[PDB]
Motif scaffolding. Structure first.
Motif, PDB file in Angstrom:
ATOM      1  N   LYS A 437       0.807  -1.354   0.033  1.00 29.89           N
ATOM      2  CA  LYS A 437      -0.041  -0.024  -0.087  1.00 29.89           C
ATOM      3  C   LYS A 437       0.876   1.427   0.043  1.00 29.89           C
ATOM      4  N   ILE A 438       1.938   1.266   1.081  1.00 26.01           N
ATOM      5  CA  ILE A 438       2.539   2.578   1.169  1.00 26.01           C
ATOM      6  C   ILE A 438       3.672   2.900  -0.061  1.00 26.01           C
ATOM      7  N   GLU A 439       4.036   1.526  -0.590  1.00 23.68           N
ATOM      8  CA  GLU A 439       4.914   1.885  -1.845  1.00 23.68           C
ATOM      9  C   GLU A 439       4.148   2.472  -3.045  1.00 23.68           C
ATOM     10  N   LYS A 440       2.949   1.849  -3.100  1.00 20.78           N
ATOM     11  CA  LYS A 440       1.977   2.229  -4.042  1.00 20.78           C
ATOM     12  C   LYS A 440       1.512   3.904  -4.115  1.00 20.78           C
ATOM     13  N   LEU A 442       3.964   6.118  -3.218  1.00 23.05           N
ATOM     14  CA  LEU A 442       5.131   6.470  -3.981  1.00 23.05           C
ATOM     15  C   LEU A 442       5.010   6.415  -5.533  1.00 23.05           C
ATOM     16  N   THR A 443       4.427   5.253  -6.000  1.00 24.34           N
ATOM     17  CA  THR A 443       4.762   4.857  -7.329  1.00 24.34           C
ATOM     18  C   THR A 443       3.621   5.191  -8.322  1.00 24.34           C
ATOM     19  N   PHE A 444       2.452   5.198  -7.997  1.00 25.21           N
ATOM     20  CA  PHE A 444       1.067   5.366  -8.645  1.00 25.21           C
ATOM     21  C   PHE A 444       0.895   6.904  -9.242  1.00 25.21           C
ATOM     22  N   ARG A 445       0.435   6.940 -10.341  1.00 25.74           N
ATOM     23  CA  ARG A 445       0.254   8.114 -10.915  1.00 25.74           C
ATOM     24  C   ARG A 445      -0.659   8.150 -12.049  1.00 25.74           C
ATOM     25  N   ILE A 446      -1.766   8.917 -11.941  1.00 23.24           N
ATOM     26  CA  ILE A 446      -2.851   8.810 -12.848  1.00 23.24           C
ATOM     27  C   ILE A 446      -2.205   9.102 -14.317  1.00 23.24           C
ATOM     28  N   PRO A 447      -2.817   8.205 -15.196  1.00 24.81           N
ATOM     29  CA  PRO A 447      -2.254   8.108 -16.590  1.00 24.81           C
ATOM     30  C   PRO A 447      -2.604   9.383 -17.362  1.00 24.81           C
ATOM     31  N   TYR A 448      -1.807  10.134 -18.057  1.00 26.37           N
ATOM     32  CA  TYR A 448      -2.150  11.339 -19.035  1.00 26.37           C
ATOM     33  C   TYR A 448      -3.391  10.958 -20.005  1.00 26.37           C
ATOM     34  N   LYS A 466     -15.833   1.847 -14.269  1.00 21.59           N
ATOM     35  CA  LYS A 466     -16.577   0.404 -14.011  1.00 21.59           C
ATOM     36  C   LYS A 466     -17.253   0.518 -12.988  1.00 21.59           C
ATOM     37  N   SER A 467     -17.456   1.548 -12.112  1.00 24.89           N
ATOM     38  CA  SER A 467     -18.096   1.333 -10.636  1.00 24.89           C
ATOM     39  C   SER A 467     -18.129   2.740 -10.132  1.00 24.89           C
ATOM     40  N   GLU A 468     -19.518   3.356  -9.640  1.00 25.54           N
ATOM     41  CA  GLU A 468     -19.261   4.566  -8.869  1.00 25.54           C
ATOM     42  C   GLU A 468     -18.726   4.111  -7.410  1.00 25.54           C
ATOM     43  N   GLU A 469     -17.815   4.860  -6.811  1.00 23.31           N
ATOM     44  CA  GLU A 469     -17.064   4.518  -5.642  1.00 23.31           C
ATOM     45  C   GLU A 469     -15.627   5.434  -5.680  1.00 23.31           C
ATOM     46  N   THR A 470     -15.039   5.483  -4.632  1.00 19.50           N
ATOM     47  CA  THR A 470     -13.992   6.577  -4.448  1.00 19.50           C
ATOM     48  C   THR A 470     -12.729   5.826  -5.014  1.00 19.50           C
ATOM     49  N   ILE A 471     -12.004   6.691  -5.643  1.00 18.40           N
ATOM     50  CA  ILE A 471     -10.584   5.921  -6.402  1.00 18.40           C
ATOM     51  C   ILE A 471      -9.620   6.334  -5.517  1.00 18.40           C
ATOM     52  N   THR A 472      -8.603   5.340  -5.446  1.00 17.13           N
ATOM     53  CA  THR A 472      -7.391   5.514  -4.674  1.00 17.13           C
ATOM     54  C   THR A 472      -6.436   4.840  -5.263  1.00 17.13           C
ATOM     55  N   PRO A 473      -5.101   5.113  -4.740  1.00 16.45           N
ATOM     56  CA  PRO A 473      -4.035   4.499  -5.841  1.00 16.45           C
ATOM     57  C   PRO A 473      -4.359   2.989  -5.667  1.00 16.45           C
ATOM     58  N   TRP A 474      -4.806   2.468  -4.818  1.00 19.63           N
ATOM     59  CA  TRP A 474      -4.967   0.854  -4.677  1.00 19.63           C
ATOM     60  C   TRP A 474      -6.248   0.279  -5.372  1.00 19.63           C
ATOM     61  N   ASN A 475      -7.201   1.103  -5.652  1.00 18.43           N
ATOM     62  CA  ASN A 475      -8.519   0.365  -6.310  1.00 18.43           C
ATOM     63  C   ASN A 475      -8.889   1.166  -7.845  1.00 18.43           C
ATOM     64  N   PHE A 476      -7.714   1.773  -8.333  1.00 21.97           N
ATOM     65  CA  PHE A 476      -7.708   2.334  -9.517  1.00 21.97           C
ATOM     66  C   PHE A 476      -8.098   1.392 -10.763  1.00 21.97           C
ATOM     67  N   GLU A 477      -7.135   0.252 -10.904  1.00 24.80           N
ATOM     68  CA  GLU A 477      -7.272  -0.649 -11.843  1.00 24.80           C
ATOM     69  C   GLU A 477      -8.756  -1.180 -11.759  1.00 24.80           C
TER      70      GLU A 477
END
Length: 1323
Positions: A437-440, A442-448, A466-477
């Motif tokens: 989680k923590i590393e993500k 540092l690493t995650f970045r929304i794609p242009y 694909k779903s109404e619900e809050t977006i987080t570095p961990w649930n973005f995919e």
RNA sequence: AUAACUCAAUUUGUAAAAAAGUUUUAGAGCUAGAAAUAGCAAGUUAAAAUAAGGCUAGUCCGUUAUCAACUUGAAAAAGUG
DNA sequence: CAATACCATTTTTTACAAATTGAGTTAT
DNA sequence: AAATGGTATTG
């Protein structure tokens, strides 16, 4: 009844004029509204609108994009604190509270002032143990001991907060363990193949020299120095170039066709090497294997500067070295300065104001500004021996946080972040359970290709969920539909088929799109051998075998190949001449080849029964750029393909869209033949019809079927054009003047509208193009004549550098102190083409070395110099356009047809924007249809180029001095109306070329001398007529006379567009605390007397308050009338409740129905017809125009440039005749400035200055009168020199006078006025 | 004047990222002096802010375009000399 | 009051679509 | 990148 309109469209003005039959601009009486004792007024119908330029959206975009960066970073740290929340609470349950409040002064704090440990003893200890966060990062990755969760949180947040760049793809290990031995693999690997010339590698300092204080490019010189018998622009120096990052032309080395340069850091590389190993043998890719093997270790050797083996935190480590060095070096300097220069010491370590150490640390002084200050001081000192060398390498007294941390990649920070987590998870179960989680974070970045992660409220957003619900570095995919979004990132920007507008254009690179492209070119190729009456078309069966054999074997098929490899070897015609394709085919099956190379199967590509698929592979490759997302949409075709080939295919990206759809090219059918456009392109009997033909052929159904599919505000329509927002404002505005002019003229449309339009920053571009050009040429000319990047604005100097200090025409060396003695020749000469760009300019010793003036450079030159022109062409020191022009004599030269075209184009407007304007107006004026149902053309829209009227003025002495007043725009709009109507009244043949809706020599002659029917001698009489109709077009005796009398008119309607200001709230500088009611709170709570703020807001618009204010102890009400400026920040609340705002400001019993909006430039008439424009709630502008008489204008014109045949006696004498026009002109500024300017000191200074310089030339006194008009210019006051005396600007620093003046509300022409007396409002 | 293709250069609009800058606080300043002040010691780091803010509450929006007056409109925009 | 003077956030990367200008080929 | 309104200082 009948009249015409002239317009002159600029970026800051529309000139407009109304003319009648006799070229006279009428005058009328207009109502005057409001409360003055004037009910009406006379107006000449000539004017201009003035406006501040409209602006590009870029600034606004860049700030928006940063805004989003800020709100996201905040959320990174928030994501981290939330993970830490529950366990940090147990260690210290206010730690995050007192990071959040660190900025607040001690008396606004809820908790102890010491942020980390919440008490002084422990905080002091922390700082002496860890002077920099880097000391702590290192400790926490290297030590094995359980660590304070707070000290963990701080290292992680600072890695997560300042996390470096996302420019390298995928994972990264520091290997600088063997820069000594990674290099020493390269030399035995190259010393195995080149056994003839074995490189004497003793491995003397591979480690050091590559990876030294100074540059990459330089350090190659310094390795090929310690290797004897080796060109640095030679095979072993080429490999090492790459190993660093530089690209070499690599062509030389192997005897090849084109310059072949790789960079091993580009993704293009993997594939590109194989383009070269295909030549030299897959038996020397181990020379580019040992190349990466050192290229790894060296990549990062400019940041990381510590042998890694001894640390897993080589970044923080280096940082610590910069610190330790900074400590040791400073303590030395502090010894030396005190044994050697004690007097200076104070200044250098105490006085912030100066750029010593105090200035560097606690002042505002750059790493650079510092070095400069103390280079003088360091060398007036016998100790700085090893300390001055550090300054030059930029290694002296370095900070850790600096401009040059740009280069740190996010993977480095992730290295230490991951390390720390591996350590402390051994003791903190929650770090184990959340390491990923923590590393993500540092690493995650929304794609242009996804953009804002909005939810129904961003006019910028296109993302799908694909779903109404809050977006987080961990649930973005799992929550963002990345494909849907990746697609619409593109689809929302791409064209629809202009022919079938519900159809989307195909990928530029579609197999179908490229087929269409050849058959269209190939269908109109025709051939001849002897024994053939006429040249014939290619036939169906002919086109196929040409496609099958040449097109699907070579990317480019050359005409040579079509002659030899087809007509000889199949058709047996030993001599064949062919028309329609000039050197090689423009068209090519580039995608057929790219594929068959990788896919490896012709029987599959050629098979029609699997087309839909191949079209969906190139659509997938064109839409997407994310090799992963490709793979996922490509995986459904894994049955059909080899695994080794998805490896290839996934990477085979494509870019660009077509102009036409699949339905058009190959779906839609002719009713009769039942055949698609591409069917006809493949075979069309002996007719061999084009695309454009089939589409217009009434014998076919394409024409009407496209007519069927075709479908149908102004404000909108203008903003959707392709031009600068600045021109798109002038455009809209002119339409609005034309709409008002039609009204003043009683709804009667004009006979004609004549339009016409005009045509550090570019000092960094030039130096950046000068460097890269010579750096590519490998010339030593910047060593030999170093240059800042601001004198390259001297076109003679810049051209000298863009030509490698050589003559462009003769292959002589150009002396760099004799550019005075030298010429700037136009390539296409000025006679034909008005281009003043560097694309048509060339520096030569004499211009006569081009040869003959009346064409392009000689064939002579073109063959002698060509080789060196391509040297500069590859260098980017010239453009392909420049190079093509320079050489044109070899491809025939400038043909009498070309030349005519170039003089026609001096008179007829091409520019696509000006045509849209003419169309907008045409389509706006001409709206009625006749019985037969065809558009009746009431109004004729006539487009002129500026050059016409500019000539006309110069030719009949109607000279403009732009700096006299804003009248010249209105004057040009007049002259454009007359020269416009007069030209098509004489030549109705030219309505073809100006109205919207031996052969070359004659055309050329006609156009060159077209405008002669205005002159008397070239023969021609006073009265001019139309031959055929016998109209009058110019009573030459009487008509110039009316031009004089229009231009001499003093009453021209100038209007500055009043404008509510918008944009930034204030200056952006976050100023320090001072006690001053000007500072503005950066947040609600941050009282700026404690925290600083902003000082300098923009007034959105002033408002006239009449109300009362409290006064004294008593609160005894007194009546006020003044301007209150409403700031951009204030505006939205002022508008919400006008009263409660002004009441909260102090005002009482505010008379609500007397408040007046007074945007910037609101015009006011005072006494003596003196006027002022509002610039702000507190500042006025010069409101009056100075209407100098014609006679003085022209005298100032001719005087200013005595540098002007037998007419230069008559023109040059006039000047010396009327030397007393000077005193008379000075007096006319004086009467004006005394009456309306009211700058008593400044007029005294100009008066004296003038009288003091009277014994000087008439030329030098006119150049400087021309300066004084700034005193008198409409607008904000501004400085100017009369000769060597400057007269700084006398500003208007109160608005009080206007409160009792006349507010004049003007229409856009200024013909309709409401006039308010403010003397009648104030209680 | 227009269409498709080829090459080069340009301009417009959008998204995602980075590094500084500045601001306040924290990093015990010491010694002598009534004080003014003097000597000296230190300095490289961090946190938080980066348009005030806004409701629509999103890891969203907040600096482009558009704007005389009067009457009519939320507006766009119509009417008016 | 006036005359005078000083001041203004900066740099960097990646990805993409469109139109336009102007040198060519084919055409309505 | 000026140009010109905000700001402060001073006479």
């Amino acid at each position: 009844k009948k009249y015409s309109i002239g317009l002159a469209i600029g970026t800051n003005s529309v000139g407009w004029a109304v003319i009648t039959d006799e070229y006279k601009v009428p005058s009328k009486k207009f109502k005057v509204l409001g409360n003055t004792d004037r009910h009406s007024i006379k107006k000449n119908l000539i004017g201009a609108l003035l406006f501040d330029s409209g602006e590009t959206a870029e600034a606004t975009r860049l700030k928006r994009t940063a805004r989003r960066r800020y709100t996201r970073r905040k959320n990174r740290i928030l994501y981290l604190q939330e993970i830490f929340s529950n366990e940090m609470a147990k260690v210290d349950d206010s730690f995050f509270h007192r990071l959040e409040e660190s900025f607040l002064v001690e008396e606004d704090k809820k908790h102890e002032r010491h942020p980390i440990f919440g008490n002084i003893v422990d905080e002091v200890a922390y700082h002496e143990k860890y002077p920099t966060i880097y000391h702590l990062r290192k400790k926490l990755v290297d030590s094995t001991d359980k660590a304070d969760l707070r000290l963990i949180y701080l290292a992680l947040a600072h890695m997560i907060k300042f996390r470096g760049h996302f420019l390298i793809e995928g994972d990264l290990n520091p290997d600088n363990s063997d820069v000594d031995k990674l290099f020493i693999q390269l030399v035995q690997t190259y010393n195995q193949l080149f056994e003839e010339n074995p490189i004497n590698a003793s491995g003397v300092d591979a480690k050091a020299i590559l990876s030294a204080r100074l540059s990459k490019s330089r350090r190659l010189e310094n390795l090929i120095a310690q290797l004897p018998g080796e060109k640095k622009n030679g095979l072993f120096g080429n490999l090492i170039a790459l190993s660093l990052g530089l690209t070499p032309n690599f062509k030389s080395n192997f005897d090849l066709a084109e310059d072949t340069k790789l960079q091993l850091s580009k993704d293009t590389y993997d594939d590109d090497l194989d383009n070269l190993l295909a030549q030299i043998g897959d038996q020397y890719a181990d020379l580019f294997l040992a190349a990466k093997n050192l290229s790894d270790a060296i990549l990062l050797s400019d940041i990381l500067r510590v042998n890694t083996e001894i640390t897993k935190a080589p970044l923080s480590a280096s940082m610590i070295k910069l610190y330790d060095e900074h400590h040791q070096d400073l303590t030395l300097l502090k010894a030396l300065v005190r044994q050697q220069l004690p007097e200076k010491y104070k200044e250098i370590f105490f006085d912030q104001s100066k750029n010593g150490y105090a200035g560097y640390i606690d002042g505002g002084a750059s790493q650079e500004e510092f070095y400069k200050f103390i280079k003088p001081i360091l060398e007036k000192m016998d100790g700085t021996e090893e300390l001055l060398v550090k300054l030059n390498r930029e290694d002296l007294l370095r900070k850790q946080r600096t401009f040059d941390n740009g280069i740190i990649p996010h993977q480095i920070h992730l290295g230490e972040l991951h390390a720390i987590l591996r350590r402390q998870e051994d003791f903190y179960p929650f770090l184990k359970d959340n390491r990923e989680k923590i590393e993500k974070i540092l690493t995650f970045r929304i794609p242009y290709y996804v953009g804002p992660l909005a939810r129904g409220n961003s006019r910028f957003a296109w993302m799908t969920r694909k779903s109404e619900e809050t977006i987080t570095p961990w649930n973005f995919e799992k929550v963002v539909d990345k494909g849907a979004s990746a697609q619409s990132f593109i689809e929302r920007m791409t064209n629809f088929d202009k022919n079938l507008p519900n159809e989307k254009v195909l990928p530029k690179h579609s197999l179908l799109y490229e087929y269409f492209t050849v058959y269209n070119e190939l269908t109109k190729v025709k051939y001849v051998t002897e024994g053939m009456r006429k040249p014939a078309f290619l036939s169906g069966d002919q086109k196929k075998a040409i496609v099958d054999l040449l097109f699907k074997t070579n990317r480019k098929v050359t005409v040579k190949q079509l002659k030899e490899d087809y007509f000889k070897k199949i058709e047996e015609f030993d001599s064949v001449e062919i028309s329609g394709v000039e050197d090689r085919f423009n068209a090519s099956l580039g995608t057929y080849h790219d594929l068959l190379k990788i896919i490896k199967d012709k029987d599959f590509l050629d098979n029609e029964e699997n087309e839909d698929i191949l079209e969906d592979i190139v659509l997938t490759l064109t839409l997407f750029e994310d090799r992963e997302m490709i793979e996922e949409r490509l995986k459904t075709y894994a049955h059909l393909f080899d695994d080794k080939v998805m490896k290839q295919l996934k990477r085979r990206r494509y870019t660009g869209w077509g102009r036409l759809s699949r339905k058009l090219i190959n779906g839609i059918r002719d009713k009769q033949s039942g055949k698609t456009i591409l069917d006809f392109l493949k075979s069309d009997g002996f007719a061999n019809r084009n695309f454009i033909q089939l589409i217009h052929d009434d014998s076919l159904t394409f024409k009407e079927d496209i007519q069927k599919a075709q479908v149908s505000s102004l404000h909108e329509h203008i903003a959707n054009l392709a031009g600068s927002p600045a021109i798109k404002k002038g455009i809209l505005q002119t339409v609005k003047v034309v709409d008002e002019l039609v009204k003043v003229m009683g709804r009667h449309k004009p006979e004609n509208i004549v339009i016409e339009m005009a045509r550090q920053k570019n000092s960094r571009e030039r130096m950046k193009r000068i460097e890269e050009g010579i750096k590519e040429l490998g010339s030593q000319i910047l060593k030999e004549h170093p240059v800042e990047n601001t004198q390259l604005q001297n076109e003679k100097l810049y051209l000298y550098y863009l030509q490698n200090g050589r003559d462009m025409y003769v292959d002589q060396e150009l002396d760099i102190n004799r550019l005075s003695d030298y010429d700037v020749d136009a390539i296409v000469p000025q006679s034909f083409l008005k281009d003043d760009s560097i694309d048509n300019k060339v520096l030569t010793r004499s211009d006569k070395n081009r040869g003959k003036s009346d064409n392009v450079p000689s064939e002579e030159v073109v063959k002698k110099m060509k080789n060196y022109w391509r040297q500069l062409l590859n260098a980017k020191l010239i453009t392909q356009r420049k190079f093509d022009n320079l050489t044109k004599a070899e491809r025939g030269g400038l043909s009498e047809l070309d030349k005519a075209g170039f003089i026609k184009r001096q008179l007829v407007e091409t520019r696509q924007i000006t045509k849209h304007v003419a169309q907008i107006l045409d389509s706006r004026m001409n709206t009625k249809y006749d019985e037969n149902d065809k558009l009746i053309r009431e109004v004729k829209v006539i487009t002129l180029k500026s050059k016409l009227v500019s000539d006309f003025r110069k030719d009949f002495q109607f000279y403009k001095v732009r700096e006299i007043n804003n009248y010249h725009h209105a004057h040009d709009a007049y002259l454009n109306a007359v020269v416009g109507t007069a030209l098509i009244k004489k030549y109705p043949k030219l309505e073809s070329e100006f109205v919207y809706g031996g052969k070359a020599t004659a055309k050329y002659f006609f156009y060159s001398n077209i405008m002669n029917f205005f002159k008397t001698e070239i023969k021609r009489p006073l009265i001019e007529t139309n031959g055929e109709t016998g109209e009058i077009v110019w009573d030459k005796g009487r008509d110039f006379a009316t031009v004089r009398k229009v231009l001499s008119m003093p009453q021209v309607n100038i209007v500055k567009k009043t404008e509510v200001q918008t944009g930034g709230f204030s200056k952006e500088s976050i100023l320090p605390k001072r006690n001053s009611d000007k500072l503005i709170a950066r947040k609600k709570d941050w009282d700026p007397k404690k925290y600083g703020g902003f000082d300098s807001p923009t007034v959105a618009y002033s408002v006239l308050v009449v109300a009362k204010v409290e006064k004294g102890k008593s609160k005894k009400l007194k009546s006020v009338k003044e301007l209150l400026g409403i700031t951009i920040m204030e505006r939205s609340s002022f508008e919400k409740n006008p009263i409660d705002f002004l009441e909260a400001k102090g005002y009482k019993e505010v008379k609500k129905d007397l408040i007046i909006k007074l945007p910037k430039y609101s015009l006011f008439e005072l006494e003596n017809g003196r006027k002022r424009m509002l610039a702000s709630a507190g500042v006025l502008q010069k409101g009056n125009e100075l209407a100098l008489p014609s006679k003085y204008v022209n005298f100032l014109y001719l005087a200013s440039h005595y540098e002007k045949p037998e007419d230069n006696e008559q023109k040059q004498l006039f000047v010396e005749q009327h030397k007393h026009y000077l005193d008379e002109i000075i007096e006319q500024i004086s009467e004006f400035s005394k009456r309306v300017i009211l700058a008593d000191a400044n007029l005294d200074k100009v008066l004296s200055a003038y009288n003091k310089h009277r014994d000087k030339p008439i030329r030098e006194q006119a150049e400087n009168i021309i300066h004084l008009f700034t005193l008198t210019n409409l607008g904000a006051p501004a400085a100017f020199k009369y000769f060597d005396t400057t007269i700084d600007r006398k500003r208007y620093t109160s608005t009080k006078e206007v409160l009792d003046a006349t507010l004049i509300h003007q229409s856009i022409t200024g013909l309709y006025e409401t006039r308010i007396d403010l003397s009648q409002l104030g209680g």
